[PDB]
Design a binder for this molecule. Structure first.
Ligand SMILES: O=P(O)(O)OC[C@H]1O[C@H](OP(=O)(O)OP(=O)(O)O)[C@H](O)[C@@H]1O
Ligand SMILES: Cc1cc(C)c(N)c(C(=O)O)c1
Ligand SMILES: [Mg+2]
Ligand SMILES: [Mg+2]
Length: 338
């Protein structure tokens, strides 16, 4: 295998041969790939139109190189709530807030995340330790019900890819990898995809791993279940993908305006988390509850309408009883206690 060969095949608009994407990603992750080669590969893959097999190869290499969590520390039914980002709309950290609420409802959550105010920035501002290694994330999950895997901490060898991603700016296939590379390897997730054309490829990757996952794209372009309009959902169950249209109004949700979901810096976004967890009613709470419920449905799938009703009931109660607010406080506390 070589760069001229792989790049030539991609510029010929041809799907890669089995193992070629893995070879490329492994060259990238081991510091053996020049910045020019990384960029060429990222772009060529993107323009060819990556397949699930290919994206699955890239993600597997990343996971091979990632720091794992200690054996037997991650529950068999752990769930992630994470999006590709890059939806061009600046929202409150819907996934992060949903994760807190899901953990509070009793579903173990191991959230993969990163800076932008991104999930990681907002958590840091809330006083949550984002920087914890495998052992301590495992303890966090055991003692709090939620662990946060900070992408840079667990994927240090991604450094060269990350630099190139910054330099070129343009979204590429690499933008799909975060939600597919949680180092704790949870089997369930609510997975946001900004890129409508690539949501199905993401779903295909999760299906190949037999995850129970909802890949979601708001029909307003949010990488979350949206409240402003309907959402497209790629439902992954039993190793196959269903595409459907999801309408929140179907559960009594009032239509919001995207401006009402808008975020700010880490301090603003942190305030918005505190507000939701303190019971503030309105658009942000509604979107958080909806996404929390979707994550619970994905968790349920590890065994539709009944699932959503129970998910919504459970998410609402976790906030209303103060369990969500208390969980965050316990999370802050856990991290201050080293
Ligand atoms: O949108 P960008 O800033 O360009 O970067 C992509 C973001 O995707 C993640 O959202 P995640 O679902 O993990 O958290 P959230 O929905 O709570 O923000 C995380 O915040 C990354 O920064
Ligand atoms: C996954 C990951 C890993 C490393 C080492 C990074 N620096 C970044 C980043 O800057 O976004 C992301
Ligand atoms: Mg998100
Ligand atoms: Mg988002």
């Amino acid at each position: 295998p070589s760069w001229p060969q792989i790049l030539g095949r991609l510029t010929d608009n041809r799907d890669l041969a089995r193992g070629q994407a893995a070879w490329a990603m492994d060259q990238i992750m081991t510091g053996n790939a020049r910045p020019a080669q990384i960029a060429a590969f990222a772009v060529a893959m993107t323009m060819k139109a990556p397949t699930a097999d290919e994206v699955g190869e890239l993600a597997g290499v990343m996971l091979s190189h990632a720091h794992p969590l200690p054996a037997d520390t991650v529950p068999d039914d752990a769930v992630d709530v994470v999006g590709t980002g890059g939806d061009g709309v600046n929202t409150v950290n819907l996934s992060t807030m949903a994760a807190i609420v899901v953990a509070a409802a009793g579903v173990p959550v191991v959230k993969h995340g990163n800076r932008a105010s991104g999930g990681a920035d907002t958590l840091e501002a809330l006083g949550v330790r984002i920087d914890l290694g495998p052992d301590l994330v495992a303890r966090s999950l055991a003692e709090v019900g939620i662990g946060f895997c900070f992408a840079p901490r667990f994927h240090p060898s991604y450094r060269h890819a990350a630099a190139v991603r910054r330099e070129i700016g343009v979204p590429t296939v690499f933008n799909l990898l975060g939600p597919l590379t949680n180092p704790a390897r949870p089997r369930a997730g609510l997975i946001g995809c900004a890129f409508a054309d690539l949501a199905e490829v993401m779903a295909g990757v999760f299906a190949a791993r037999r995850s129970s996952v909802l890949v979601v794209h708001g029909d307003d372009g949010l990488d979350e279940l949206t409240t402003t309009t309907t959402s497209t959902i790629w439902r992954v169950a039993a190793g196959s993908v269903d595409k459907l249209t999801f309408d929140p109004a179907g559960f009594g949700f009032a239509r919001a305006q995207l401006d009402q979901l808008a975020g700010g810096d880490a301090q603003a976004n942190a305030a918005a988390v505190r507000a939701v967890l303190g019971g503030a009613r309105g658009p942000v709470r509604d979107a958080v509850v909806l996404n929390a419920a979707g994550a619970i449905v994905a968790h349920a799938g590890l065994s539709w309408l009944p699932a959503w009703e129970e998910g919504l009931r459970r998410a609402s109660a976790a906030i209303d009883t103060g369990a969500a607010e208390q969980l965050l406080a316990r999370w802050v506390r856990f991290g201050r206690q080293i």
